[PDB]
Amino acid sequence: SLKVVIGYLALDDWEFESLFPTIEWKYLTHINASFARVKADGTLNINPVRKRIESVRETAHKHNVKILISLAKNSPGEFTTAINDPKARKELIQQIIAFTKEYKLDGFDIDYEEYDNWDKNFPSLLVFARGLYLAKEKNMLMTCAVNSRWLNYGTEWEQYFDYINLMSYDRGAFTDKPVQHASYDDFVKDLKYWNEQCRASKSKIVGGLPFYGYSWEESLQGAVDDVRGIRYSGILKHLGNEAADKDNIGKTYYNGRPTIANKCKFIKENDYAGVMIWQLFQDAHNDNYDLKLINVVGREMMEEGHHHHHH
Ligand SMILES: N[C@@H]1[C@@H](O)[C@H](O)[C@@H](CO)O[C@H]1O
């Protein structure tokens, strides 16, 4: 089966202008334009993507990369409210299909993360999934960003998606207490979980990879964001190039090149669909080109090899 590399791209990222011209398209098969936000009434807040979606699509397509619009809650409870209301649900489904057609995208990605009353709300989420699947075009791609092991998705869910992107990161990282938010062991167990418990064929299961981490270091308390999150580019900037080949330095935990490489290796060695990346823009800049994580994924998943013309 064909391997994939699905990269998330935040279209309203502060570093967009500067970094967009550097996207390594040869190492990507799909990109998820980051978030048209779902509103309580089923309508979409497309402010984070409206200004660049068309331009991103033209570029992606020029490099034969598929582009999907990723959807997530506008604010807590809004995505749930939308799917729990019949008319708002039908409106939402029409908006997604319409946005996808209007901007000539290849599909859409569902990133539903309303954890309040998860089990109670799942039947309505399924009703939503079934609907989108029925309303979408046959050729339109339909993917989803999912959690593993800690939340049930049942065994029906899987069949409606071309690719299931496992968010194997942020594990136990929102308290004091430094932790590795994306360990190798958790990555492997998450993959197993979807194949053995959610009964999803390995052929559509894709392992998520983080191009960022967290730091509980006192010296970086202002460099990290809202939740102590820090980009790989930030990690190299403050911790030095030596950080590129480790998953931890002091109280800063992330995924260095060896681990990213090893996760990619596991994917290939066990015939999974491929890998996914949360935020391509978080990667190192060209000042550290050789230490870029996308190049590690590229060397593992999209290695051209030695070839010649006139075969
Ligand atoms: N014709 C091939 C190219 O397609 C390939 O990209 C290049 C890589 O070095 O080798 C050439 O022989």
Side-chain angles (χ1 to χ4, degrees):
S1 196
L2 297 177
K3 313 171 216 299
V4 298
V5 175
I6 307 178
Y8 270 99
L9 197 70
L11 269 56
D12 62 337
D13 197 293
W14 302 119
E15 301 182 86
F16 189 91
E17 290 294 308
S18 172
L19 306 185
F20 189 63
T22 68
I23 304 302
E24 201 63 62
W25 303 102
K26 68 177 175 184
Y27 292 156
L28 296 170
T29 57
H30 306 69
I31 56 160
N32 290 335
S34 273
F35 325 132
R37 298 286 185 166
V38 182
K39 305 178 64 174
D41 64 11
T43 67
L44 304 175
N45 163 15
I46 64 178
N47 281 39
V49 304
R50 182 176 65 280
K51 300 176 182 179
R52 291 154 175 167
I53 186 63
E54 284 186 61
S55 184
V56 174
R57 172 193 55 64
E58 301 183 310
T59 302
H61 282 185
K62 190 52 184 168
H63 292 81
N64 294 111
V65 173
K66 302 296 182 184
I67 178 169
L68 300 76
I69 174 59
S70 184
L71 298 115
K73 65 189 174 184
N74 187 57
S75 77
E78 294 204 63
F79 206 151
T80 302
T81 293
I83 66 168
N84 266 38
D85 176 58
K87 50 198 61 181
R89 164 168 51 63
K90 300 177 185 181
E91 177 64 40
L92 176 55
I93 293 176
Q94 305 186 326
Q95 296 242 344
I96 292 173
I97 301 300
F99 185 90
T100 301
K101 285 187 176 184
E102 157 124 300
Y103 290 107
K104 310 183 179 188
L105 312 188
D106 303 290
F108 48 89
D109 176 65
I110 302 301
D111 179 7
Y112 184 84
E113 298 188 42
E114 298 275 40
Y115 307 124
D116 183 53
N117 296 309
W118 179 267
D119 280 17
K120 179 195 296 182
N121 292 304
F122 209 79
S124 56
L125 186 64
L126 275 167
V127 174
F128 176 59
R130 295 163 182 157
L132 269 180
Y133 186 72
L134 306 177
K136 81 179 188 58
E137 224 81 70
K138 188 181 299 177
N139 173 59
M140 260 182 223
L141 291 175
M142 178 165 157
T143 66
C144 62
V146 304
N147 284 295
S148 303
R149 298 149 68 197
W150 72 286
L151 280 182
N152 297 298
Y153 280 82
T155 68
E156 179 191 339
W157 182 258
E158 163 286 313
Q159 80 189 72
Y160 304 114
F161 305 95
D162 292 286
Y163 295 108
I164 298 182
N165 305 317
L166 279 52
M167 308 186 274
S168 195
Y169 34 74
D170 308 311
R171 187 175 288 286
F174 304 103
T175 68
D176 289 3
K177 177 192 181 183
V179 305
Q180 165 55 66
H181 85 288
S183 73
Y184 178 81
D185 185 51
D186 284 306
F187 179 76
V188 175
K189 292 174 179 174
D190 285 355
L191 291 168
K192 305 280 192 177
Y193 170 75
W194 272 91
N195 180 58
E196 293 172 49
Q197 300 192 60
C198 301
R199 288 192 58 192
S201 171
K202 291 183 187 172
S203 183
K204 67 166 56 171
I205 297 176
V206 38
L209 304 171
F211 276 16
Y212 66 95
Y214 294 89
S215 183
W216 284 261
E217 283 297 319
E218 318 67 57
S219 69
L220 305 182
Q221 61 194 311
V224 300
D225 67 21
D226 187 318
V227 295
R228 294 202 180 84
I230 178 174
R231 303 185 161 194
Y232 178 66
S233 65
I235 288 167
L236 296 186
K237 173 185 173 61
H238 295 98
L239 297 184
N241 294 1
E242 288 163 336
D245 301 306
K246 306 188 176 73
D247 288 345
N248 161 259
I249 292 179
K251 305 185 191 65
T252 298
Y253 291 93
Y254 54 106
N255 273 187
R257 303 192 300 173
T259 285
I260 290 300
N262 291 328
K263 287 181 178 178
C264 286
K265 299 283 194 54
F266 184 84
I267 286 295
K268 288 149 58 178
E269 288 175 45
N270 296 80
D271 306 301
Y272 277 98
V275 296
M276 170 268 284
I277 301 159
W278 167 244
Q279 185 72 106
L280 291 167
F281 287 136
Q282 298 171 318
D283 204 350
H285 300 180
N286 286 20
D287 67 311
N288 277 304
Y289 188 81
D290 293 306
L291 304 176
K292 291 180 68 183
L293 297 177
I294 187 59
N295 295 344
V296 175
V297 174
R299 288 192 289 280
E300 292 301 322
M301 307 303 291
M302 298 286 134
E303 72 130 49
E304 171 170 58
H306 301 290
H307 295 281
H308 56 278
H309 298 280
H310 310 160
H311 188 60

